[PDB]
Amino acid sequence: FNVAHGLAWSYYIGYLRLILPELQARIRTYNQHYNAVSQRLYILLPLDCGVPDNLSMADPNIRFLDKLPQQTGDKAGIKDRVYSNSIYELLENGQRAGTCVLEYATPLQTLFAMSQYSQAGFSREDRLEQAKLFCRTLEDILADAPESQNNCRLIAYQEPFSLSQEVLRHLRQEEKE
Amino acid sequence: FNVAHGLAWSYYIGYLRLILPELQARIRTYNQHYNAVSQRLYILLPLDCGVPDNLSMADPNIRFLDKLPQQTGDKAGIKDRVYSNSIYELLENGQRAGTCVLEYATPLQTLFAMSQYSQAGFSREDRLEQAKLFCRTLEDILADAPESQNNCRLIAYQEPFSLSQEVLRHLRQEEKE
Ligand SMILES: Nc1nc(=O)c2ncn([C@@H]3O[C@@H]4COP(=O)(O)O[C@H]5[C@@H](O)[C@H](n6cnc7c(N)ncnc76)O[C@@H]5COP(=O)(O)O[C@@H]3[C@@H]4O)c2[nH]1
Numbered sequence: 001f002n003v004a005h006g007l008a009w010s011y012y013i014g015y016l017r018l019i020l021p022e023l024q025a026r027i028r029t030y031n032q033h034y035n036a037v038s039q040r041l042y043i044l045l046p047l048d049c050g051v052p053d054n055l056s057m058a059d060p061n062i063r064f065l066d067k068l069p070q071q072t073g074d075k076a077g078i079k080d081r082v083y084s085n086s087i088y089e090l091l092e093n094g095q096r097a098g099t100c101v102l103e104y105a106t107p108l109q110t111l112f113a114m115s116q117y118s119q120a121g122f123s124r125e126d127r128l129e130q131a132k133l134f135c136r137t138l139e140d141i142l143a144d145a146p147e148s149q150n151n152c153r154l155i156a157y158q159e160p161f162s163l164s165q166e167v168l169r170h171l172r173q174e175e176k177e
Numbered sequence: 178f179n180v181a182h183g184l185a186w187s188y189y190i191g192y193l194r195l196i197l198p199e200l201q202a203r204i205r206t207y208n209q210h211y212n213a214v215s216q217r218l219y220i221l222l223p224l225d226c227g228v229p230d231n232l233s234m235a236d237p238n239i240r241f242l243d244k245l246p247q248q249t250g251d252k253a254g255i256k257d258r259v260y261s262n263s264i265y266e267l268l269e270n271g272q273r274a275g276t277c278v279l280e281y282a283t284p285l286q287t288l289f290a291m292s293q294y295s296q297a298g299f300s301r302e303d304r305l306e307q308a309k310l311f312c313r314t315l316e317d318i319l320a321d322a323p324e325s326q327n328n329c330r331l332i333a334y335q336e337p338f339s340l341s342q343e344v345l346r347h348l349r350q351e352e353k354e
Contacts (some may be wrong), residue, residue, distance in 0.1 A: 054251060
């Protein structure tokens with residue numbers, strides 16, 4: 001029916017509510033320790049199309065550089081379950097034009113897969129509007145979450161382009177203020 | 178409305194479909210390498226109550242021993258995202274009566290949390306039947322999944338007891354055949 005609403009709240013309480021409070025603290029460690037990546041976490045949400053696993057192939061201008069400090073903790077009986085993220089370099093005309101923490105909204109690929117299996121009661125036409133609904137309920141969550149306080153920026157998009165440009169646009173404008 | 182159905186399918190396509198095919202292979206590595214833990218993955222699903230993060234406190238007789246070999250791979254733009262599980266010793270009258278890979282159905286604690294936040298449209302009364310629905314749709318998935326082929330056993334339960342006994346019951350009976 002409306003699976004996206006539930007998955008958005010799962011994205012909050014099982015991930016971002018966990019890693020947002022300590023995110024900025026762990027970026028400082030990397031930058032301070034390494035000779036710079038900006039503070040926010042940038043989450044890609046392709047609405048129409050699917051979610052690749054390697055951004056470098058989704059857009060060659062998005063080159064991955066290094067990892068962050070891992071985040072560990074016991075969650076649901078697994079001692080030292082570790083949450084890790086990735087830092088990507090974004091190029092423009094062969095020039096390093098940005099650096100930041102970039103990743104896809106993993107639940108989006110769950111939706112894409114569920115629209116294939118039969119007994120999920122989820123048709124391939126509903127896919128777009130569910131991706132839209134997911135992108136939006138998550139927006140409502142982050143505006144009034146105490147954990148989200150200039151922590152992350154949603155990058156929604158739909159493709160009939162170049163992704164590296166789309167993320168650059170969000171980077172360039174958060175530096176404006 | 179009916180959030181559990183969606184979360185069950187998220188549990189399959191984002192976790193068990195990933196780690197079940199290689200699970201048994203990675204258990205052999207541990208046992209063969211370490212001087213024994215049985216092959217299945219045992220997933221706890223408390224329906225009424227919540228999901229603690231440390232089983233040793235949920236039941237003192239469930240003592241954690243060691244970890245498995247980590248499982249890594251790129252998923253949604255995070256290079257070398259790692260999935261790890263935990264191996265627990267289960268005691269009986271102060272005696273080591275079992276060893277296996279044990280964990281909670283993480284989505285269950287997502288449900289428990291969502292029943293608190295206001296704008297999730299999810300009341301605290303619906304909690305039990307949603308946990309029931311989650312336990313069941315997942316059963317339907319594992320019966321006809323090609324990835325699940327004597328890989329894991331669901332341990333559902335509801336508490337007005339001793340958990341270590343409940344898991345032992347499932348261990349003792351899978352050894353009967
Ligand atoms: N991008 C990203 N990186 C992460 O490290 C990460 N960890 C969680 N999540 C996303 O947040 C939510 C996690 O909630 P939960 O863990 O309760 O459900 C998860 C979780 O129960 C199960 N799962 C995934 N990894 C593990 C794990 N290491 N241990 C147990 N369960 C896991 O599979 C469900 C769906 O995961 P994803 O569908 O890949 O995206 C998850 C999910 O939407 C992550 N997203």
